[PDB]
Design a binder for this molecule. Structure first.
Ligand SMILES: [Cl-]
Ligand SMILES: [Mg+2]
Ligand SMILES: [Mg+2]
Length: 79
């Protein structure tokens, strides 16, 4: 479980393309239910404004995990 290099930047500087790459990494690394990138068409600054409920409406089957993954990155936790 190692973050892609470009995603090692603080998330507030993440592009919308970075967000898409994060979704792909997460899906593969944690074997999540498939996520459509069109459901998170936003940059990192916007992504950080989302609540857990917001993630779940965009990805009913993977939203919760995605939110908790982002929380772990923000907390600089390990993994
Ligand atoms: Cl902006
Ligand atoms: Mg930017
Ligand atoms: Mg972009």
């Amino acid at each position: 479980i190692r973050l892609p290099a470009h995603l090692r930047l603080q998330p507030i500087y993440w592009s919308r393309d970075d967000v898409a790459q994060w979704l792909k990494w997460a899906e593969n690394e944690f074997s999540l239910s498939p996520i459509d990138s069109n459901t998170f068409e936003m940059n990192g600054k916007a992504l950080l404004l989302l609540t857990k409920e917001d993630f779940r409406y965009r990805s009913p089957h993977s939203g919760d995990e995605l939110y908790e993954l982002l929380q772990h990155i923000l907390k600089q936790r390990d993994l």
